[PDB]
Amino acid sequence: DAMTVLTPLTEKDYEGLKRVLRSLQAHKMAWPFLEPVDPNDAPDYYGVIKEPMDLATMEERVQRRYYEKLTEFVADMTKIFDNCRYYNPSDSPFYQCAEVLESFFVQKLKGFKASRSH
Numbered sequence: 001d002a003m004t005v006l007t008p009l010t011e012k013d014y015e016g017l018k019r020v021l022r023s024l025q026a027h028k029m030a031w032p033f034l035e036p037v038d039p040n041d042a043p044d045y046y047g048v049i050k051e052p053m054d055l056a057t058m059e060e061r062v063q064r065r066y067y068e069k070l071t072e073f074v075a076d077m078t079k080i081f082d083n084c085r086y087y088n089p090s091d092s093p094f095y096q097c098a099e100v101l102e103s104f105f106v107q108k109l110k111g112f113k114a115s116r117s118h
């Protein structure tokens with residue numbers, strides 16, 4: 001959609017973005033991504049992952065109106081899942097959570113884009 005690329009985010013749009021974010025935070029499989037990765041759970045994580053991201057950081061940026069275009073919001077969300085699949089092996093519970101939660105996000109994102117005009 002060109003509106004995703006070109007149209008600045010409005011206060012109305014941010015009500016939808018908060019709804020998408022809350023739906024992910026409530027998802028059963030979102031537990032590994034609610035808060036930043038604890039370095040004591042993964043000692044070399046922050047030397048390996050250049051741009052870490054988590055849902056609590058995105059909650060702060062949504063509240064602060066940090067995002068100006070929908071592309072930037074999708075980019076932050078995608079970092080969460082791409083970081084996880086790059087650091088972890090395919091049989092990790094974190095990796096499997098990233099697979100289900102990203103599919104859930106795409107569903108919710110399609111819903112946000114569809115209703116963005118009404």
Ligand SMILES: Cn1ncc(Nc2ccc3c(c2)CCNC3)c(Cl)c1=O
Pocket residue numbers: 031032033037038041042045083084087088094
């Ligand atoms: C490499 N690595 N390590 C952790 C993590 N999340 C995460 C979040 C909370 C808790 C745990 C893990 C384990 C036990 N305490 C609660 C991710 Cl997503 C990751 O990729």
Ligand SMILES: [Ca+2]
Pocket residue numbers: 078079082
């Ligand atoms: Ca990526």
